[PDB]
Amino acid sequence: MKTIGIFYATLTKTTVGIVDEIEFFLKKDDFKTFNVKNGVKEIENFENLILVTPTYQVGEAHAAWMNNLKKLEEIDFTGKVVGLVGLGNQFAFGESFCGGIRYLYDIVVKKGGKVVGFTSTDGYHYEETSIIENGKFIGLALDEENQPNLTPKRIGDWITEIKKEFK
Template identity: 55%
Template sequence: MEKIGIFYGSNTGKTAAIAEEIEFNLRKENYETINVADGIDTMPEFKNLILLTPTYGVGEVQEDWANVMPEFEKIDFTGKRIAIVGLGNQFAFGESFVGGMRVLYDVITKNGGEVIGFTSNVGYKYEETNSVIGDQFVGLALDENNQDDETPDRVMAWVEILKKNFY
């Protein structure tokens, strides 16, 4: 498998902790983890990407992602496989649960990328979200406020799927 670029934005540390959980499950693979606050200029170098964002406001990406969005929107994702992780609170913000994930998804698909790692929406109790297509999230949806006990198993199963589908 080719090297994986893991890019995340985090205010409270929860998303950074999920990046570490992903690293743990990729322990024998070649990867590099980058906080988007430090820039995304190396992103085009990777054919395999994992992008993580918590959701803020009404379905918006985290502020460091928002700061790099003009640059992100210019990246040609053709020939790349990208997996997305969205964090949110399905009860407190059930009307836009993990909406930040959809912001990334829309840019990636518009710019020619292949999004992998869709997951079932079964087991969640959100009101609505634009991050579901059919009956699947456009990536891995995590609720560290209400379902953190399910995170390790969700991440482990998801990473195993990614390993089979990355270049």
């Protein structure tokens, strides 16, 4: 399996614990981890990607991702296999839960990438959503406020699934 590039951002550090969990499930696999507050340049260097963002400002990604969306779109994603992870709060944001991964998704598929790791919408409460395609969420959706006890298995199952598609 080619080395996995893990890219995240965080405001209040919740995402740091989620990244640590991803890294734990990749304990036997080569990965490298980057905080996109330091830019997105290195996304170019990996064939396998895990892009992680908490949700801010009505369904947006963290500002460090938003500020780099033009740079991200400059990257050629052809032949890359990408899993997306959002963190959000589904009851406080009934219309924008984990909406940040939509900004990443649209760029990855536009630039030739393959997005993997769609997840079931069962077990979530939402009034509206912008992160569904084909009846599933376009990535892994985590809610540490309301469903922290589901996060470890949600991540472990997801990592098992996307590793089957990874190069």
